[PDB]
Amino acid sequence: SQSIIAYTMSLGAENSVAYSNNSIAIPTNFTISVTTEILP
Amino acid sequence: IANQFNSAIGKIQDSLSSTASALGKLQDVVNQNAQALNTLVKQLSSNFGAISSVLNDILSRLDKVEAEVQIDRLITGRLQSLQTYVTQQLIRAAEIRASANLAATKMSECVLGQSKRVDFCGKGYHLMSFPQSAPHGVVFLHVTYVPAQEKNFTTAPAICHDGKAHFPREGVFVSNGTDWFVTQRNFYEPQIITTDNTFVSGNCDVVIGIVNNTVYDPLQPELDSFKEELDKYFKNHTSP
Amino acid sequence: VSMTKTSVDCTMYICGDSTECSNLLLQYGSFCTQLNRALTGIAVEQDKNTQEVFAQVKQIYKTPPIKDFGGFNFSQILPDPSKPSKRSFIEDLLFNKVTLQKFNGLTVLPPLLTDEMIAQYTSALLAGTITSGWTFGAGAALQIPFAMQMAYRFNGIGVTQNVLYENQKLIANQFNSAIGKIQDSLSSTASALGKLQDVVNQNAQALNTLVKQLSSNFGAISSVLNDILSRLDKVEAEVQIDRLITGRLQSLQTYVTQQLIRAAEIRASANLAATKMSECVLGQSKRVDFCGKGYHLMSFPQSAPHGVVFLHVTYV
Amino acid sequence: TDNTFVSGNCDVVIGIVNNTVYDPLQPELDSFKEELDKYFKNHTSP
Ligand SMILES: *[C@@H]1O[C@H](CO)[C@@H](O[C@@H]2O[C@H](CO)[C@@H](O[C@H]3O[C@H](CO)[C@@H](O)[C@H](O)[C@@H]3O)[C@H](O)[C@H]2NC(C)=O)[C@H](O)[C@H]1NC(C)=O
Ligand SMILES: *[C@@H]1O[C@H](CO)[C@@H](O[C@@H]2O[C@H](CO)[C@@H](O[C@H]3O[C@H](CO)[C@@H](O)[C@H](O)[C@@H]3O)[C@H](O)[C@H]2NC(C)=O)[C@H](O)[C@H]1NC(C)=O
Ligand SMILES: *[C@@H]1O[C@H](CO)[C@@H](O[C@@H]2O[C@H](CO)[C@@H](O[C@H]3O[C@H](CO)[C@@H](O)[C@H](O)[C@@H]3O)[C@H](O)[C@H]2NC(C)=O)[C@H](O)[C@H]1NC(C)=O
Ligand SMILES: *[C@@H]1O[C@H](CO[C@@H]2O[C@@H](C)[C@@H](O)[C@@H](O)[C@@H]2O)[C@@H](O[C@@H]2O[C@H](CO)[C@@H](O)[C@H](O)[C@H]2NC(C)=O)[C@H](O)[C@H]1NC(C)=O
Ligand SMILES: *[C@@H]1O[C@H](CO)[C@@H](O[C@@H]2O[C@H](CO)[C@@H](O)[C@H](O)[C@H]2NC(C)=O)[C@H](O)[C@H]1NC(C)=O
Ligand SMILES: *[C@@H]1O[C@H](CO)[C@@H](O[C@@H]2O[C@H](CO)[C@@H](O)[C@H](O)[C@H]2NC(C)=O)[C@H](O)[C@H]1NC(C)=O
Ligand SMILES: *[C@@H]1O[C@H](CO)[C@@H](O[C@@H]2O[C@H](CO)[C@@H](O)[C@H](O)[C@H]2NC(C)=O)[C@H](O)[C@H]1NC(C)=O
Ligand SMILES: *[C@@H]1O[C@H](CO)[C@@H](O)[C@H](O)[C@H]1NC(C)=O
Ligand SMILES: *[C@@H]1O[C@H](CO)[C@@H](O)[C@H](O)[C@H]1NC(C)=O
Ligand SMILES: *[C@@H]1O[C@H](CO)[C@@H](O)[C@H](O)[C@H]1NC(C)=O
Ligand SMILES: *[C@@H]1O[C@H](CO)[C@@H](O)[C@H](O)[C@H]1NC(C)=O
Secondary structure, eight states, rough: OOOOOOOOOOOEEEEEEOOOOEEOOOOOEEEEEEEEEHHH | OOHHHHHHHHHHHHHHHOOTTTTTTHHHHHHHHHHHHHHHGGGGGOOOSSSSSSSSHHHTSSSHHHHHHHHHHHHHHHHHHHHHHHHHHHHHHHHHHHHHHHHHHHIIIIIIOOSSTTTSSSSSEEEEEEEEEEEEEEEEEEEEEEEEEEEEEEEOOOEEEESSEEEEEESSEESSSSEEEEOOTTSOBOOBBTTEEEEEEEESSSSSSSSOOOOOHHHHHHHHHHHOOOOHHHHHHHHH | OOOOOEEHHHHHHSSSOOOOHHHHGGGTTTTTHHHHHHHHHHHHHHHHHHHEEEEEOHHHHHHHHSSSSSSOOOTTBOOTTTTSSSHHHHHHHHHSSSSOOOTTTTTOOSSSSSSHHHHHHHHHHHHHHHHTGGGGGGGSSSOOOHHHHHHHHHHHHTTOOOOTTHHHHHHHHHHHHHHHHHHHHHOOTTTHHHHHHHHHHHHHHHHHHHHGGGOOOOOOOOOHHHHHHHOOOOHHHHHHHHHHHHHHHHHHHHHHHHHHHHHHHHHHHHHHHHIIIIIISSOOOOOOSSSSSSSSEEEEEEETTTEEEEEEEEOO | OOOOOSSSSSTSSSSSSOOOOOTTHHHHHHHHHHHHHHHHHHHTTO
């Protein structure tokens, strides 16, 4: 019931920024994120 | 903040405890050094044209004057093999140094300091990072402030109170759609629009999109308190 | 940002329609497989490089239907939907001002990201840039009006934000005229694209040099293989043939070494371009002479054939 | 005194120059003193 699928690659989640000449989205909470990065 | 931070150090530990292949960037170095050494060993089997590839089997089958023709062969192709390898390794050495210069730069600007560079110390606003050893590598645990719960607000670039135009010292003017406030640029914590939160320049004809609201003065209730105090003492001093 | 990908069949380069040439090539062992690997290790790096330069956002941001950016007329650099390509006007110059074998086993297989996909990433980077300011580079895309984004920029260069609002009509006019000088300069000369036209000419001339070496004698009586196998006997024609195997294998090794050395410089270029994408587009760099000349306010990325082109916006 | 700030005496800073520094408290304390002064002059009449 598994098989190989082939597809055009999605660039990302598509989204529209809710812009107006008088509108702003000040953030009101945060998450401290710890992310790993690896270098030789 | 601490509970989130501790939970995030948890998540990294559980991630690398659970998954198979996050260190692929380091394993492909150790894999390439092994696989190139092995290829350099494989070439010891190549005839390169010779009757045999085993050097001693030539010397135990041919004499000093005719064996030299086969041996020159093996010397040619093995020397070609080593120059292939040493070129391939010198090229890697340039990639690994470029990687190590980036790692020193991240140690310097992310561990020994705080960086304003966007995502140079991982994808967020950089708070700090912790270095970790890994075999032939370094791993950075980058710690980052990331904005979460957004809310929309109306805003204006300036305020009018008495024909004069006001601007935030730090932060931005916001409204919930009833009342006007000033708040810092990265986290909603609104304040009453005082003359200590703001500064003034020019007049309301020039600023495109300016809006009207009262600008408060913390000297006003003080002075008002002096008034009531003074007016009482003048009412009082009518009596004697 | 990249060179072309390439694969060569080492056997079809050295030999071709001659089984006894392959029976001689096998006498030299693993080299041909190592060469093919080596160019695969370049080709994989080309899609990695292109994806690290352009894919710095995990969301496509569409530019809003109404263009009320306080007077900044981005329409020269925002995508035009009315055209068959979804390129911008300025990048449809870049796509033309740079200009551009299968018989010999050489294959020049396509990149992973197509030009219409790179156009979409540079669209989302620009569209986030003008609608969100920098916030999408750190967290969510958070809208703010463009004349307040520019006010923050001004604060960033240490200039007090009344200096924007008291001059907004002038500042947008200066900006809009300056996006004109870019347009017209790119319309005027090729000498601006030379950093790309060079790396395109150089990878082309490298393949073209590898092909012409097929005609070299290397001390064999002819480079035409069928001369050697028809006119001479099996045991002395083998001696004439090992000359061609040896010369042609050195030729391929020269091309592969040269391509690795080049690909090391293209990497360095891609890591710079990815760093300028993060620090100049997704932000406002404090670094002198990094995001162009002056004090940095913002930049706009464009696609070009195998490259990225930054419009750096600066206060002077 | 809201655009500037004060520290030490004028003998240590090589190349300092003299000028008046305005304080925005003063004319408000003054415009209160003249009003209060009037309150005193009027209040002499009862
Ligand atoms: C927008 O934000 C405003 C600030 O939070 C908010 O106004 C505030 O609303 C509270 C009630 O929720 C008022 O409470 C006081 O109201 C009178 C004042 O004389 C007293 O009778 C009450 O006991 C109480 O002290 C606040 O005074 C008021 N703040 C201001 C600055 O007026 C709005 O309601 C919010 N609007 C929206 C749409 O969210
Ligand atoms: C912001 O607040 C201001 C004060 O309430 C207000 O300014 C006032 O605007 C009106 C309309 O443009 C002007 O009306 C007068 O115009 C001329 C004289 O200038 C007369 O011939 C008219 O009969 C009328 O009296 C006011 O002069 C003007 N006052 C001030 C102090 O500027 C703004 O309109 C307000 N804007 C918003 C959007 O709230
Ligand atoms: C800047 O303003 C200063 C304050 O008014 C002023 O300092 C004053 O300078 C004079 C002359 O040097 C001093 O005069 C005294 O000098 C000696 C004693 O030290 C005596 O021989 C004199 O009779 C006299 O008493 C003032 O004492 C001095 N003020 C203070 C507080 O010491 C500067 O001269 C001004 N400079 C310029 C360039 O404007
Ligand atoms: C902030 O508001 C925008 C849109 O403006 C709002 O429009 C009404 C729905 C009402 O709430 C008004 O008071 C606001 O001014 C939001 O964008 C919309 O989001 C929905 C999903 O939630 C989406 O389906 C719509 O297409 C969006 N509309 C537009 C014009 O963009 C935005 O999500 C709000 N953001 C936050 C953080 O609250
Ligand atoms: C900010 O977000 C955090 C979580 O990221 C919120 O913390 C949670 O709060 C709820 C109750 O409101 C609890 O059920 C969760 O267990 C809490 N999580 C943690 C890690 O403590 C927090 O409430 C939010 N703060 C604001 C002001 O919105
Ligand atoms: C943005 O500026 C461009 C020009 O740089 C404007 O495009 C021109 O618009 C006029 C009127 O529609 C046309 O006659 C020209 O032929 C257009 N030129 C080009 C190159 O398209 C555009 O209209 C401006 N938009 C805004 C919102 O001001
Ligand atoms: C700042 O410099 C700009 C030009 O770079 C000046 O704007 C010009 O003003 C003259 C009239 O004085 C006009 O002829 C031009 O058409 C204007 N150009 C633009 C782009 O608007 C401006 O006057 C200067 N301002 C100050 C205060 O010196
Ligand atoms: C904001 O945009 C609306 C149209 O959407 C327009 O009517 C209004 O005048 C604009 N205001 C400013 C200050 O640009
Ligand atoms: C008047 O003021 C004095 C203090 O100055 C106080 O002792 C006195 O009781 C006051 N009397 C009245 C009638 O206010
Ligand atoms: C500045 O230079 C002049 C000489 O040209 C000198 O008289 C004066 O004392 C100097 N001022 C300072 C603050 O060094
Ligand atoms: C003078 O004082 C009386 C109260 O004694 C007050 O009603 C009046 O308004 C005052 N007039 C002025 C000019 O201050």
